[PDB]
Amino acid sequence: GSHSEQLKHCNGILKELLSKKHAAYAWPFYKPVDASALGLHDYHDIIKHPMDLSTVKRKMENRDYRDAQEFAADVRLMFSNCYKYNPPDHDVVAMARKLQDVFEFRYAKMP
Ligand SMILES: COc1cc(=O)n(C)cc1-c1cc(NS(C)(=O)=O)ccc1Oc1ccccc1
């Protein structure tokens, strides 16, 4: 209903995205993409605004999100970056779709 009640609900969503239940498809999103280590050609030229769950967690922990909409935008940016950069048949795209299914359903249940 209110900003704080909506933010509490978003903290609940983040907790689920970082739970053991979803870890089999969430782990590539736990930390920022390390383009050098992975040999991700032109990653930082194609992706202007990198995002990952550790960044979303740091922002939630410090109360940096003013509303639920800011939180949604960051999570969605993380999935959108993954779809934009990677080939459609890469395993990480399938993991991203799986985690996003979890996010979208819980975010839609926000009162
Ligand atoms: C191309 O890999 C990615 C592309 C991408 O858009 N995202 C968000 C994440 C990855 C990714 C990142 C790391 N390690 S990391 C966080 O950079 O330290 C490890 C595995 C990763 O995915 C893989 C999944 C299955 C097979 C191969 C890779």
From Swiss-Prot:
Effect of substituting N86A: Abolished binding to histone H4 acetylated at 'Lys-12' (H4K12ac)
Record localization: Nucleus; Chromosome
Residue ranges of domain Bromo in the record: 4-110
Reported effect, L40A: Reduced binding to histone H4 acetylated at 'Lys-12' (H4K12ac)
Effect of V33A: Abolished binding to histone H4 acetylated at 'Lys-12' (H4K12ac)
Domain remark from Swiss-Prot or TrEMBL: The first bromo domain specifically recognizes histone H4 acetylated at 'Lys-12' (H4K12ac). It also specifically binds histone H4 acetyl-methylated at 'Lys-5' and 'Lys-12' (H4K5acme and H4K12acme, respectively). The second bromo domain recognizes and binds histone H4 acetylated at 'Lys-5' and 'Lys-12' (H4K5ac and H4K12ac, respectively).
Oligomer and partners: Homodimer. Interacts with E2F1. Interacts with (acetylated) STAT3; promoting STAT3 recruitment to chromatin. Interacts with CTCF; promoting BRD2 recruitment to chromatin. (Microbial infection) Interacts with herpes virus 8 protein LANA1.
Additional note from the record: Some specific inhibitors of BRD2 that prevent binding to acetylated histone are promising therapeutic molecules for the treatment of cancers or inflammatory diseases. ABBV-744, a small molecule, has been tested on tumors with success: ABBV-744 antiproliferative activity is mainly restricted to cell lines of acute myeloid leukaemia and prostate cancer and is able to displace BRD4 from chromatin. GSK046 (iBET-BD2), which specifically inhibits the second bromo domain, is a promising therapeutic small molecule for the treatment of inflammatory and autoimmune diseases.
Family per similarity comment: Belongs to the BET family.
Protein function: Chromatin reader protein that specifically recognizes and binds histone H4 acetylated at 'Lys-5' and 'Lys-12' (H4K5ac and H4K12ac, respectively), thereby controlling gene expression and remodeling chromatin structures. Recruits transcription factors and coactivators to target gene sites, and activates RNA polymerase II machinery for transcriptional elongation.
Full protein name: Bromodomain-containing protein 2
Range of the intact protein held here: 347 to 454 of 801
